[PDB]
Structure formats: C-alpha cells, structure tokens
Amino acid sequence: LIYTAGGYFRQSLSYLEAYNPSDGTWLRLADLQVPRSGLAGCVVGGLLYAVGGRNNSPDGNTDSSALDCYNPMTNQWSPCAPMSVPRNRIGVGVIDGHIYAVGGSHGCIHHNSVERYEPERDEWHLVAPMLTRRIGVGVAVLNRLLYAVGGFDGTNRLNSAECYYPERNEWRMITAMNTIRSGAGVCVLHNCIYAAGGYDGQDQLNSVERYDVATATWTFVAPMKHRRSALGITVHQGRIYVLGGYDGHTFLDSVECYDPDTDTWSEVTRMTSGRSGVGVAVT
C-alpha cells in the first residue's frame, strides 16, 4: 500500500491513509498522535516512520523533532526517540536500516545539520553536516549514497545537489539540476534519481528531471499534468506516485503516476481531501 501521513489543509493534519493501486481504495488508519505537516515518511523493517514536520494549529505553531513508528500489523503508532532538533520541511533517506534526517527548519534556523537514527537502539547520532543549509530538501538513496537535492537556504532557492558518503562521513557537491526547486518530490526509480515539481520562487513546477550517476547528468523528462510544490512522492512496483501538493491556488488531491517505460504521466486517483506537505512511503 501507499501510505500518506500528515499534511496541511489550513492546519496540521493527523490523517494516515493507505492507497491500493489495484483496488483503487483508500484505507483510513490510526491517526498520528500529533497533527503534522512538512514531515517525511520512510519504511524500515516493514515499520512506517513519520519524521519531523510542524504542528500548525489554531492553538499554536511548533516545529517537530518527533519520530513516530506505525505498525501495519497492529494499526498502532508508537513514539521513538526524537531528533536533536525540530526539522520542518525535512528530507529523509534510508541507508542500511538507518534513517537519515536532512535539513529542514526550526523557526528562523535553516539546518545544514544531518543526523542518523538506529532503530535497533532507538538512538539518534549527529553526523557530517551538509555543505548547504536546505529546507524543503528532497532526499534519495542510490547505491548506499545519500543525495540531498534542491531546497531553500533562507535567502535563495537551490538547484544544487550534494551527496553524502557515510563511511567517509562527508558531503561532496555533485552536478546541479537544470531547475531550481524547493519542496520538490525526490525519489529513486530503477537506477536514477528523480526530482519532480517544486517551487523556484516564482512558479510551482511540473517539470521532472532525472540524474544518472554514471554520466553525472540531469536530464529533463515528461512533465506532470499539474504543477505542484510540497508534494508527496514514492515508488510502487516500478512506477512513481506523486500525491497532492500546492499549485499557488489550491491544495491538490490529485495523484499522478509516472510509467518509466512509456515516459508518460497519468492521473490514477484523488486523495480523500487535498493537502500538501505529506509524508509518503510504501509497506
């Protein structure tokens, strides 16, 4: 199933819903303990993790350091140890069963810091920080290397990308994208990193480009139907799914699906309500 947690629609949402690309159904599951937007989702050992974000409520607005784990066999959330700092508009990636939390913001603070979570010890450990402060950063893992793509540094939005080598514990700049993107959806499909949509400071984007490590090159591909920033993204059975987002006017419920063999995007479902800044993952 394609799980989507949290998101925003005038207040941090608590929804956890799972989409069945065969059935076409959405499944309402246990609510997040705290409503959150700008979080990231990932899966380790079949458990779904919701990482960082922010609680925008009529009673307050606090960025979240929280890590929470959802078990689909019990339909229960359980808290984990929290990150060292709150991280709104975070990016995350999974290397070797460890969760990497990248960038994000805490109030005025725009993080370049990065930290790693080890589920078998419920511990977070600070690691080599990025060369760039990045909020709304897209994160993808390719051949056990961690890529941080785009984002916003507090002043400029970015087309730069950089790559983290965990065993050297260091970050190295790579070839920049063709397009400046903050709040894009970044994923790995087959053997390439995809960066879809985002915001460049003027327009929400529908363009999609993909990085080939062998040629260290970004190439423009078929665009999505709907421009969107702060979208959710994931890979299910060799296809890319993008969920929701914001197009400068509305919070989208559209779900688009990229087929790499045809280089086409189709619309396959609508979420139960439009929302941006969700955490998406598959288990």
Nearest Cα residue to 36 out of 270, 281, 275: 275
Cα separation, 98 vs 83, in Å, equals 13
Place of tokens 């079949």: 46
Determine the Cα–Cα distance for residues 74 and 126; give it in Å rounded to an integer: 31
DSSP state, residue 44:
E
Nearest in space to 40 (alpha carbons), one of 251, 282, 280, 235: 280
Asked if 47 and 69 count as a contact pair (C-beta separation under 8 A), the reply is yes
Query: Please, how many CA atoms are within 13 Å of residue 138, restricted to the half-sphere of its CB?
Result: 34
Q: Which residues pair with 62 in a beta bridge?
A: 55
> 43: how many CB neighbours lie within 10 A of its CB?
17
C-alpha to C-alpha distances, 107 to 29, 84, 86, 87, nearest whole angstrom: 31, 15, 9, 9
Report d(CA 94, CA 198) in Å as an integer: 22
**DSSP character for 206?**
-
Is the domain spanning 4-283 CATH 2.120.10.80? The answer is yes
Helix (H, G, I), strand (E, B) or coil at 216: coil
Print the SS3 string covering 95-143. ECCEEEEECCEECCEECCCEEEEECCCCEEEEECCCCCCCECCEEEEEC
DSSP labels, 149-197: EEEE-SS-EEEEEEEEETTTTEEEE-PPPSS--BS-EEEEETTEEEEE-
Quote the tokens at residue 259. Answer: 């087929």
CA 113 → CA 101, 217, 230, distances in Å?
Answer: 9, 26, 21
- Judge whether 280 and 38 are in contact, CB under 8 Å: no
> Could you tell me the residue ranges of all domains in the chain?
4-283
Structure resolution, Å: 2.1
